[PDB]
Design a protein around this ligand. Structure first.
Ligand SMILES: *CC(=O)Nc1cc(C)no1
Lengths: 179, 244
């Protein structure tokens, strides 16, 4: 019954809030998707170990540099999120979020998560990105970034289709359990 | 929370809270607006409840069952009485605005048309000044409250006994001492997100779109002032550490 804390970080529209909601409810909300996430305590059993995983969000704190670090105390695993339909949100991963998470959370495993992977095949996503001389984040660009920032690993998921969501959180539990 | 309010805000949305034949009578844009307003009140009800767990369950229980200085309990629960009054008054104003909007013969069917006014009173003038001062005070004592809980939980067996005892119910799963403290620090940064999504579907009446635009600017001004006012306190800090 060990207790572990998980905090998800990332830019405004990286889908961190949708991801925590979809995992804690265990389905894509059919009628209404909530604007905000309060907190949750998930009961996870990974590789034979039972863990109470407390989930937290940093949405709303991105502009407040003194309030935001109050979410970090005693974090056991960091989910560093970016959105596959926003290659610019990936550029901020090593320049803004990594040095802050390493400063406040030394030696805490970080999993780089590419969210919204369904948008890699969406036509409106490609057409709009190509207007700004861009295209969806490629699987190798995510893996290289995780490698460069010294991440524990790289994962992709789609909160809209629920694909990869369960595996991200069970892996995060494993990462939190390593001494 | 009180049973009446918990049932009124038990559904996942305004669409599911109201009767289906009442929902059918409204435009999609209104349903979308109502869903975000219902989420703002539902989360405010949960916020006030979190503060009652801190004041009535944790704070008062420690005073009545343990032998700790009143200074220890004050360091574990800074500003909780002031925060509880600020938000219980806000919640009363939001719940009354909903009640006034109820159809006669119904306790569940309503539509809130005016909201920007209530949000402007909460986040402007004297009331906003006290809330801003209260949040800079709370957030500057947040780390010290956490270290003090951990110091007492690892050195005091009777404090540990008390904690295991009052946090045993399943309803308290995500509401332990440190969780309540972060839930309260995170509350203020939620308001702009909810207000921005309410404004996104309030373009039908220009007086209302303007009221919500003013309210969005007021919460962001408040937040920036609370963020500027934070200077973290340390448990047992020396004077030399502070003036450097
Ligand atoms: C947040 C805040 O309003 N702080 C404050 C204002 C004045 C005047 N003194 O402290």
């Amino acid at each position: 019954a060990i207790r572990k804390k998980l905090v998800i970080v990332g830019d405004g529209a990286c889908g961190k809030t949708c991801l925590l909601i979809v995992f804690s409810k265990d389905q894509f909300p059919e009628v209404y998707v909530p604007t905000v996430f309060e907190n949750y305590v998930a009961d996870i059993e990974v590789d034979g170990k039972q863990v109470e995983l407390a989930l937290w969000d940093t949405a709303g704190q991105e502009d407040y540099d003194r309030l935001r670090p109050l979410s970090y105390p005693d974090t056991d695993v960091i989910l560093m999120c970016f959105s596959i339909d926003s290659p610019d949100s990936l550029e901020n991963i090593p320049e803004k979020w990594t040095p802050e998470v390493k400063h406040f959370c030394p030696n805490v495993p970080i999993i780089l998560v590419g969210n919204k992977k369904d948008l890699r095949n969406d036509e409106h996503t490609r057409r709009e990105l190509a207007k700004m001389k861009q295209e969806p984040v490629k699987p190798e660009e995510g893996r290289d970034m995780a490698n460069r920032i010294g991440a524990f690993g790289y994962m992709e998921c789609s909160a809209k289709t629920k694909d990869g969501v369960r595996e991200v959180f069970e892996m995060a539990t494993r990462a939190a359990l390593q001494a | 929370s009180m049973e009446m309010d918990e049932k009124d805000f038990a559904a996942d949305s305004w669409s599911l809270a109201v009767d289906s034949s009442f929902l059918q009578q409204h435009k999609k844009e209104v349903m979308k607006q109502q869903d975000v307003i219902y989420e703002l009140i539902q989360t405010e009800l949960h916020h006030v409840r979190t503060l009652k767990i801190m004041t009535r369950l944790f704070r008062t229980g420690m005073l009545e069952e343990l032998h700790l200085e009143p200074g220890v309990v004050q360091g574990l629960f800074p500003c909780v009485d002031e925060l509880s009054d600020i938000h219980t008054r806000f919640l009363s104003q939001l719940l009354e605005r909903r009640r006034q909007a109820l159809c006669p013969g119904s306790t569940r069917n309503f539509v809130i048309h005016r909201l920007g006014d209530l949000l402007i009173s909460q986040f402007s003038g004297p009331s906003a000044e006290q809330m801003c001062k209260t949040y800079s005070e709370f957030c500057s004592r947040h780390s010290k409250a956490l270290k003090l809980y951990k110091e007492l939980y690892a050195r005091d067996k009777r404090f540990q006994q008390f904690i295991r005892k009052v946090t045993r119910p399943a309803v308290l799963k995500r509401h332990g001492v440190q969780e309540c403290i972060l839930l309260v620090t995170q509350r203020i940064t939620k308001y702009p997100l909810l207000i921005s999504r309410i404004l996104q579907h309030s373009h039908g009446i220009e007086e209302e779109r303007q009221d919500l635009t003013t309210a969005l600017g007021l919460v962001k001004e408040l937040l920036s002032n609370v963020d500027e006012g934070i200077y973290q306190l340390e448990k047992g800090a020396r004077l030399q550490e502070i003036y450097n």
